[PDB]
């Protein structure tokens, strides 16, 4: 659990792209990498009446929003790890680096 990098976004394709090419950036140094972990996907739901004036049949409207989370474990020296993590980041994807 030496180095924890967590990525999360709103686009499954973008999240997968970042993880896959982060691994090749890791695979070019010979770090010890624990495989990516897919955390459970979370959906935020909001239900709202469609009408703006309260008339007619009571018809509703359900909106959703999905969030994908991935986890990667790296065991390497700090000045090295910053070099791996210096890659370009796709728009909409955030990356958090933590050490426990």
């Amino acid at each position: 659990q030496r180095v924890l990098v967590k990525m999360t976004s709103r686009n499954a394709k973008a999240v997968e792209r970042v993880v896959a090419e982060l691994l090749e950036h890791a695979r070019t140094e010979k770090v010890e990498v624990r495989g990516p972990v897919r955390l459970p996907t979370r959906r935020l739901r909001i239900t709202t009446r469609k009408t703006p004036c309260g008339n007619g049949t009571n018809t509703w409207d359900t909106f959703e929003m999905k969030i994908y989370k991935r986890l990667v474990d790296l065991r390497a020296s700090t000045e090295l790890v910053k070099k791996i993590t210096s890659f370009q980041i796709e728009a909409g994807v955030d990356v958090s680096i933590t050490i426990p």
Binding site: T57, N58, T59, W60, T62
Partner: protein, 142 residues
């Protein structure tokens, strides 16, 4: 000196039962810690007991059965246990034994009940707006 072990599973509604069958000096069946023949609902005891009573106790001679159930109420958990037990002996007999011995118990199992080896695919239906349940609608007044 040697270890014989198999792991199977069964599901009824959302309960998942995981059964481990191993060779032991004497047969024992424990469900969530408390042994069989001590489950309070006698009706549910009979349903679990029938997994061995159909093929006879001679095939469960020196086997140890350990089952753990999680989720989905009371009756649905009993049905998942009996399916994980039935799949367990069949899986155990598949190896460590000839092929003729297997498929001699399967026919007895599938003759009595299909669900003893095949999971029931039924699940709860989602609720829709404008309805009190999946099907029933709001009352009309005129």
């Amino acid at each position: 000196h040697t270890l014989k072990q198999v792991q199977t599973f069964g599901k009824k509604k959302t309960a998942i039962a995981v059964a481990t069958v191993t060779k032991a000096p004497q047969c024992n069946i424990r469900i969530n810690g408390v042994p069989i023949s001590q489950i309070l609902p006698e009706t549910l005891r009979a349903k679990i007991m029938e997994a061995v009573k159909v093929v006879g106790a001679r095939y469960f001679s020196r086997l140890r059965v350990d089952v753990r159930v999680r989720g989905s109420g009371q009756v649905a958990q009993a049905y998942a246990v009996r399916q994980a037990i039935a799949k367990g002996i069949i899986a155990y007999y598949q190896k460590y034994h000839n092929e003729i011995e297997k498929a001699a118990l399967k026919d007895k199992y599938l003759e009595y009940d299909k669900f003893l080896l095949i999971a029931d695919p039924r699940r709860c239906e989602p609720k829709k707006w404008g309805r009190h349940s999946a099907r029933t609608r709001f009352t009309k007044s005129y």
